[PDB]
């Protein structure tokens, strides 16, 4: 149960969604970009916290923040 907030500085480069190993992010239509897209995080209980989405965001001081919060059984990735 992390918190992946997306800010208005996205450019719809789509790179944050590809890096996510757990499919937390996905693109929705938007208008504040030439791409007309913005990241959204509908599945954040699945967020593992790897911040691999933040490494891919190219906007300077990146538009997507993982906010490591209450860690549960699927946000810590336990197979046992």
């Amino acid at each position: 149960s992390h918190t992946v907030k997306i800010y208005d500085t996205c450019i719809g480069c789509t790179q944050c969604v590809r890096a996510c190993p757990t499919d937390v992010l996905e693109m929705v239509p938007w208008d504040g970009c030439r791409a007309g897209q913005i990241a959204s995080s509908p599945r954040t209980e699945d967020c593992v916290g790897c911040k691999r989405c933040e490494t891919a965001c190219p906007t300077d001081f990146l538009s997507i923040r993982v906010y490591l919060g209450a860690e549960t059984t699927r946000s810590m990735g336990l197979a046992y």
């Binding site: 208005d8 996905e26 929705v28 959204s40 995080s41 509908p42 990735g77």
Partner: protein, 139 residues
């Protein structure tokens, strides 16, 4: 529901543990045109079948690790399910039937802040309040 023939695999040690049938469990289901061999996300190698393939994995990251491997075999028809122990099977990937890199209609901006990240409020503003600085209904 879910069905398919399991790949040729001699069984591993990295597979399902007691969390599989107690909390919940995942299943990736894909169709292959060829009888080739893929790397198991739980260590090892398995031979994927000719028709409908079914594989049980402990956590969702393994399924999308394997799903990202299937795209290197030019297979993009895989579906990831989530099996609760009581038995019902949810469809979770791809959630709308199209892959999340693609943009649909009807999807909603969820956890979107309509401000730059730079003007999140200071922690003193939300002092002794339920919210954090990053939800922050201002702007």
């Amino acid at each position: 529901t879910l069905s398919g023939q399991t790949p040729i695999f001699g069984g591993s040690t990295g597979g399902l543990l007691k969390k599989a049938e107690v909390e919940e469990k995942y299943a990736i289901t894909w169709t292959s045109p060829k009888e080739q061999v893929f790397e198991m996300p739980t260590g090892g190698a398995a031979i994927m079948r000719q028709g409908q393939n079914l594989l049980y994995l402990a956590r969702k990251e393994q399924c999308i690790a394997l799903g990202g491997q299937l795209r290197k075999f030019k297979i993009t028809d895989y579906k990831i399910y989530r099996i609760y122990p009581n038995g019902e099977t949810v469809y979770i990937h791809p959630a709308d039937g199209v892959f999340p890199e693609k943009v649909n209609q009807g999807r909603e901006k969820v956890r979107y802040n309509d401000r730059r990240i730079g003007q999140n409020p200071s922690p003193s503003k939300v002092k002794f309040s339920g919210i954090a600085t990053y939800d922050a209904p201002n702007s």
